Write a protein that binds this ligand. Structure first.
Ligand SMILES: [Mn+2]
Ligand SMILES: [Mn+2]
Ligand SMILES: [Mn+2]
Ligand SMILES: [Mn+2]
Lengths: 133, 133
């Protein structure tokens, strides 16, 4: 998966979970992309077997698509939590995560996860960190 | 500056500091790039006034090029220190930093810097973090 591919699967996952389906119109709006570009990507993902097209619904995710999707959602969520814990401007967190999410090994994600846990279990660690700012 | 542009300036800075000059041969080898691609980039950076060409030397950095270069070197160094502190596999740190460095605001770098300081001033914080792993 490329960065674009990962953003599409993650965005299709978010849509099924929150609403109940993925149509190309919703993808185009959400991702800030042209509708025909979504078509060419849906093709790639279908052939690479990340998704199926159901007839009177829209895009459904395969078994593989859903495993990848949930992993992508988790990663984005953790990175946001991480930048929020460390004190990054709220306005900047989403732009940072949008870019950095594709360029970290899972080993880094594993370790960022442990770092989040470190701060979550003792509030005094967070206060100490914030005193340095 | 694009990601490629930032990698070129940072790599030209590292070369002047460590050796004494930047030639295109050294850039091509270091960046894993074709020699004629370096030429087309040196052109961009010259026109955008990040570097000059001195006659019996090679690429020298402008005033602007050196300010940017040192900022890029600092950022890469801090991110490595950061991933090292959090326990990322040594083999993976450089690949992660190579990618993520271009997609973080300075506000994030400022805050990662404070996080590094947090761990550097009390060794017990590091031990606590490592016990979670
Ligand atoms: Mn994303
Ligand atoms: Mn993204
Ligand atoms: Mn670099
Ligand atoms: Mn890079």
């Amino acid at each position: 998966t490329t960065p674009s591919m990962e953003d599409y699967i993650e965005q299709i996952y978010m849509l099924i979970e929150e609403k109940g389906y993925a149509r190309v119109s919703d993808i185009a709006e959400a991702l800030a992309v042209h509708p025909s570009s979504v078509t060419k990507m849906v093709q790639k993902l279908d052939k690479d077997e990340y998704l199926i097209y159901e007839k009177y619904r829209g895009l459904v995710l395969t078994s593989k698509g859903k495993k990848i999707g949930k992993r992508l959602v988790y990663r984005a969520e953790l990175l946001e939590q991480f930048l929020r814990i460390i004190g990054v401007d709220e306005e900047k967190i989403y732009n940072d995560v949008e870019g950095i999410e594709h360029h970290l090994s899972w080993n880094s994600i594993d370790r960022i996860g442990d770092l989040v846990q470190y701060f979550e279990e003792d509030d005094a660690r967070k206060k100490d960190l914030k005193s340095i700012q």
